[PDB]
Design a protein around this ligand. Structure first.
Ligand SMILES: Nc1ncnc2c1ncn2[C@@H]1O[C@H](COP(=O)(O)OP(=O)(O)OP(=O)(O)O)[C@@H](O)[C@H]1O
Ligand SMILES: Nc1ncnc2c1ncn2[C@@H]1O[C@H](COP(=O)(O)OP(=O)(O)OP(=O)(O)O)[C@@H](O)[C@H]1O
Ligand SMILES: Nc1ncnc2c1ncn2[C@@H]1O[C@H](COP(=O)(O)OP(=O)(O)OP(=O)(O)O)[C@@H](O)[C@H]1O
Lengths: 341, 361, 286, 70, 69
């Protein structure tokens, strides 16, 4: 009512947007705005003074440098990288052969949060995350378990050591903010895939050095260990080669669960071809036995790419049904690809 | 809305109080004293002003390098400001509230005792050591196997008697644009001296303790500044520093910090780590969780996993009820989980046995 | 709307007027710099190859309603490997020119980092510009050199760009949205083997970049010869056979640099001899 | 940041010379002791189309360099 | 009102009339660099239309490197 028509005359019309430097128990707050300016602000209104804390943005009324209201504005560089969303149409039911592998991780990710009643009454509580890996180049097949996880709660994916070591640091602080922002969005899932920090050869741009790289990773462990945060921000690690990472990383996490990705057998590969070709239309003469017999140590995306190139070649004839001669001639292209060099 | 109603209704008295002190801009550092009435002062505005002070402030209270308020019109000194340094790095350095009480110990006795008397007893009974002094020691050093790194400090958090202490993370000392760590390490010391006996703890000193010299090129120069400025500011004579010390890392390396500590530090202890008869103690703490059958023997299971510290046997108690949920069992029978416990120790030792003993060896 | 120029009044400090701003023009600045337009009429010899890339690029732009009919996923990216050569850079913006979609290049120095955010992963905020404007084509420019042929510093140095396209394709397939976003590789050898070590044959489109050929030299010779006044007594058959190997960019060296001798001779029309001069000029440095 | 602004000023003159395209008029000659620090955008064709490298003196140049000083 | 032009500001122009030191008879060694530079400098500057005749766009870009010498 009258207060809205009162306090507005004090702040307006012009006002500046500064930053909070430090607070004094005398209700005088020291503000800093562009460029390099200080002051004593004491206001009893709209505060919220305890939730502000130094290091946040505050308004400045021209007369005289008073803060009428609080502003939390994001935006921010890091907040942009977490969303959105995906909520992908794919599910954990579109993959097969890892049922024995997936059972434990699916359980472990749905162990907390959803289905809490048997979890909370048992008093186990293993909230250190999970650790993934496999050969030869998989780990995306383990990401095919992250899509099902993207269907539940909140998800964030941070991959590759380039985002830290491309320039000088400041080291982990880029990760340190990911922890806290995920705490503000808790519960959320943070997935990290292919950690090359110790496996990289040449750093990006001009930065050093091999041992500083290690120290930012070690501070990542203490962040992850950790002292002292109980929040999740559930963390999942994944890579191709676990031997590169130091055993110093395993005790803090993941001490309870780590999975290994086995190579698929004949029955699994048959399932894989089934799931991809479900949407595709194939000729009657295409058989699933000879295909998986001729292939040796191939993942889902390989049998995927051969079908993609079969349909691409079938587009030259503008045919939606891929014949077995076209399928085999297309298969020979990726077969010659891996066998050329 | 009612609290915001009364919150916005105090601006009528606030605007009357808004006339004074709102011209106090800005904060300015003094330079020299030519005489008693007149002082030269510098401000961030880049204009250095020589000016007098207000008659409400005693001139004997202003010492060189004290920041004070100013009435821009007359430029005279208004009110001094105690706080000076630093931006948000300090507030991030500060920690509060307890957790992880003493009941969370895994059976270590002589360890926890000998480190209790270095820190907690001097501040618990100060008159005792001053009477019978001699003098309490400066501080300690922690390291060894991972179980249990860094949790022992949480014990001091919950056992802290009155004044909270500050914990510090190691890797934040070293930063891009060399010369930021110099200000960094210095300011927290002055803060501590105002904090009257508050504790400062650096984790993973091995990151900033890289020793010593290499051919070329530095390299360790920006590292050596951090450590050596640390030790130099640690070897100052005033006070110094009453705030005691606390240190922890992983490996005993490197030699330079290790050769500098025994002069200024003492009481280096090594883990220990679960003794045979002590391994069961971790099982006694974790026994309060879930439900322990009266026929379960902890001493039998404990010998089957040497060198596992407390983490791995925590995952033992964890995988008990974990695999019990999948089998719908409410309580974990001793014979049920051990079949998965030999598997959970061996299968995780297959790729790596976790040789922390080899990390420093 | 944010990020628009607006007049500011003196008294109330209000918004007097609305004025237009420039944000993409700074992007297209380096764009038109780094690459010209080069429509299909300015390229020759890749007819067989542009046939291959046409179905890859045009399908998500125009056809996709048949994608679900054939149950085939959209292609994520494509690569061009072969001795330079030229046109692999031109073809990208040529297809994008006929697609009307915006053309975006990777780093980019220096000034792609400042224009887009302050500091970050740098593969996200850029992707936020490509999300703002779709469809858009992403190109890898360039880090193709013999420098940089060591496979020690050169590999690990470009392998962060290979990690760029890795995590970008990992984005496209894993999360975010939606289609039309593609990546193009232009390089020759060496780190092609490192990318196929990072690419376990999964997934990408394989397109070879061919060396210049005789019959490929004829038509392209005429193409670059379209802008310089000359008589018709010039035999394009014999002149192309004299230049085996070399590169695509050598064609322009021939034509252009031959023009200077004619300008020294003051002749308005050039002669066959004068072009055959610059032939030798470009064969001495080889 | 002012150095970055003056290299965006180098880009701004890089834009102004596009203002000079075409015909009338300007002439820009450029030399450097080390070309490894130059950004590819400057050496890119369309703006600096000529790269002239100073060769090490040779026998033909020896006799000329001796005649001129003598 | 705007600048005439041109009254500057800074630098300034001229100052080169009382200079330069010596003519080109000094350095006679190169002869392959001068043929490039001369054709890339004085020829486009003297005749602008001669380039438009033949249909070649004269560049303004001149880059030098190699020292020492
Ligand atoms: N049993 C299965 N059923 C269905 N799909 C499968 C199965 N196994 C694997 N896949 C699919 O095969 C793909 C394999 O991905 P791939 O390992 O080729 O990724 P990648 O390119 O190696 O990733 P990165 O480069 O990040 O390691 C997965 O996306 C997964 O969806
Ligand atoms: N002997 C023990 N008594 C009680 N708890 C233990 C013991 N050993 C391990 N733990 C528990 O195991 C958990 C994991 O230890 P943690 O990984 O934090 O050690 P760390 O800090 O990594 O060691 P370091 O700092 O040396 O690397 C700790 O929270 C700790 O409570
Ligand atoms: N097929 C071709 N034959 C001859 N010249 C060509 C051909 N394609 C392009 N060029 C010329 O080469 C120049 C550069 O083209 P483009 O940018 O595609 O190659 P580039 O990527 O610069 O070469 P590089 O890979 O060596 O950097 C263009 O000005 C064009 O006139």
């Amino acid at each position: 009512e009258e207060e809205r028509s009162k306090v507005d005359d004090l702040r307006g019309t012009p006002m500046s947007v500064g930053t909070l430097e430090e607070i004094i128990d005398d209700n005088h707050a020291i503000v800093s705005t562009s460029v390099g300016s200080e002051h004593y602000v004491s206001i009893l209104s709209f505060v919220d003074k305890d939730l502000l804390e130094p290091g946040c943005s505050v308004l400045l009324n021209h007369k005289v440098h008073a803060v009428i209201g609080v502003l939390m504005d994001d935006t921010d560089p890091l907040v942009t990288v977490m969303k959105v969303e995906k909520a992908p149409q794919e599910t954990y039911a579109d993959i097969g052969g890892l049922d024995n592998q997936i059972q434990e991780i699916k359980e472990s990710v749905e162990l907390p949060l959803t289905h809490p009643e048997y979890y909370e009454e048992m008093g186990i509580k293993p909230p250190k995350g999970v650790i993934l890996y496999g050969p030869p180049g998989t780990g995306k097949t383990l990401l095919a378990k992250a899509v099902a996880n993207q269907t539940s709660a909140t998800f964030l994916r941070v991959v590759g050591s380039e985002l830290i070591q491309k320039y000088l640091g400041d080291g982990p602080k880029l990760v340190r903010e990911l922890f806290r922002v995920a705490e503000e969005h808790a519960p959320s899932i943070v997935f990290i895939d292919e950690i090359d920090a110790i496996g990289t050869k040449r750093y990006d741009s001009n930065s050093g050095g091999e041992r500083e790289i290690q120290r930012t990773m070690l501070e990542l462990l203490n962040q992850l260990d950790g002292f002292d945060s109980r929040g999740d921000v559930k963390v999942i690690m994944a890579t191709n080669r676990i031997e590169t990472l130091d055993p110093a990383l395993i005790r803090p996490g993941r001490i309870d669960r780590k999975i290994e990705f086995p190579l698929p057998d004949e029955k699994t590969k048959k399932r894989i071809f089934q799931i991809h070709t479900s949407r595709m239309t194939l000729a009657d003469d295409v058989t699933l036995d000879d295909l998986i017999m001729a292939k040796d140590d191939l993942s889902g995306a390989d049998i995927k790419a051969i079908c993609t190139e079969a349909g691409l070649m079938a587009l030259r004839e503008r045919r939606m049904k891929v014949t077995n001669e076209d399928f085999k001639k297309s298969k020979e292209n990726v077969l010659y690809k891996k066998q050329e060099g | 809305a009612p609290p915001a109603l009364w919150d916005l209704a105090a601006d009528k008295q606030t605007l009357q109080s808004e006339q004074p002190l709102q011209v106090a801009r800005c904060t300015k550092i003094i330079n020299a004293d030519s005489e008693d009435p007149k002082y030269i002062i510098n401000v961030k505005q880049f204009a250095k002003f020589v000016v007098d002070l207000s008659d409400q402030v005693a001139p004997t209270d202003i010492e060189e390098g004290m920041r004070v308020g100013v009435d821009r019109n007359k430029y005279q000194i208004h009110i001094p400001l105690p706080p000076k340094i630093d931006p948000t790095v300090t507030m991030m350095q500060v920690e509060e509230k307890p957790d992880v009480t003493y009941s969370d110990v895994g059976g270590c006795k002589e360890q926890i005792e000998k480190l209790r008397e270095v820190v907690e007893t001097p501040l618990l009974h100060p008159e005792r050591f001053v009477n019978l002094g001699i003098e309490p020691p400066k501080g300690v050093l922690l390291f060894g196997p991972p179980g249990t790194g860094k949790t022992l400090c949480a014990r001091a958090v919950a056992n802290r008697t009155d004044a909270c202490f500050i914990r510090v993370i190691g890797s934040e000392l070293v930063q891009k644009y060399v010369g930021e760590g110099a200000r960094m390490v210095r300011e927290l010391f002055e803060m501590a001296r105002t904090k009257k006996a508050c504790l400062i703890f650096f984790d993973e000193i091995d990151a900033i303790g890289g020793a010593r010299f290499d051919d070329g090129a530095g390299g360790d120069n920006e590292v050596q500044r951090t450590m050596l400025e640390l030790i130099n500011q640690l070897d100052g004579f005033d006070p110094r520093g009453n705030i005691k010390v606390l240190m922890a890392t992983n490996r005993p390396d490197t030699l330079d910090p290790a050769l500098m500590r025994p002069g200024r530090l003492d009481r280096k202890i090594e883990f220990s780590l679960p003794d045979l008869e002590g391994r069961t103690h971790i099982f006694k703490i974790h026994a309060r969780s879930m439900s322990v059958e009266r026929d379960i023997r902890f001493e039998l299971l404990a010998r089957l996993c040497p060198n596992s510290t407390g983490a791995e046997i925590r995952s033992v108690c964890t995988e008990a009820g974990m695999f019990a949920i999948r089998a719908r069992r409410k309580i974990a029978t001793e014979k049920d989980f051990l079949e998965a416990v030999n598997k959970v120790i061996k299968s995780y030792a297959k790729f790596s046995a976790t040789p922390r003993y080899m990390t420093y060896n | 709307t944010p990020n628009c120029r607006v007049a500011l009044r003196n008294d109330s400090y209000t918004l007097h007027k609305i004025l237009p701003n420039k944000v993409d023009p700074l992007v297209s600045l380096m764009m038109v710099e780094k690459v010209p337009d080069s429509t299909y009429e300015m390229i020759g010899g890749l007819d067989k190859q542009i046939k291959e890339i046409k179905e890859v690029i045009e399908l998500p732009v125009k056809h996709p309603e048949l994608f679900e009919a054939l149950g085939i996923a959209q292609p994520k990216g494509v690569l061009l490997y072969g001795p330079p050569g030229t046109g692999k850079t031109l073809l990208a913006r040529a297809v994008a020119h006929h697609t009307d979609c915006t053309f975006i290049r990777v780093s980019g120095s220096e000034l792609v980092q400042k224009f887009i955010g302050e500091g970050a992963r740098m593969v996200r905020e850029l992707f936020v510009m490509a999300r703002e404007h779709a469809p858009s084509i992403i190109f890898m420019d360039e880090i193709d050199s013999i420098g940089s042929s060591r496979l020690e510093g050169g590999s690990g140095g470009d392998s962060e760009v290979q990690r760029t396209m890795l995590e970008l394709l990992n984005q496209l397939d894993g999360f975010e949205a939606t289609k039309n976003i593609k990546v193009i590789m232009a390089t020759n050898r060496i780190d092609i083997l490192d990318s196929a070590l990072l690419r376990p044959g999964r997934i990408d489109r394989k397109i070879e970049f061919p060396p210049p050929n005789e019959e490929a030299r004829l038509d392209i010779l005429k193409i670059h010869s379209r802008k310089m006044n000359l008589t018709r007594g010039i035999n394009l058959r014999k002149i192309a056979e004299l230049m085996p190997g070399a590169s695509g960019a050598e064609v322009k060296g021939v034509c252009t640099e031959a023009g200077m001798y004619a300008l020294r001779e003051r002749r308005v029309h050039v002669t066959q001899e004068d072009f055959e001069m610059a032939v030798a000029k470009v064969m001495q440095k080889d | 940041g002012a150095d970055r602004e003056v290299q965006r000023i180098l880009l701004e003159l890089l834009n102004q010379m596009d203002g000079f395209d075409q015909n009338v008029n300007v002439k820009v000659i450029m030399a450097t002791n080390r070309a490894d620090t130059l950004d590819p955008a400057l050496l890119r064709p369309g703006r600096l189309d000529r790269k002239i490298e100073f060769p090490l003196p040779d026998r033909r140049q020896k006799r000329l360099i001796f005649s001129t000083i003598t | 009102d705007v600048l005439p032009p041109e009254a500057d500001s800074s630098i300034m122009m001229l100052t080169s009339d009382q200079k330069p030191d010596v003519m080109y008879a000094d350095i006679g060694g190169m002869d392959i660099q001068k043929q490039e530079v001369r054709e890339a400098v004085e020829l486009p500057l003297t005749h602008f239309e001669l380039y438009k005749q033949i249909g070649i766009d004269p560049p303004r870009g001149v880059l030098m490197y190699g020292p020492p010498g």
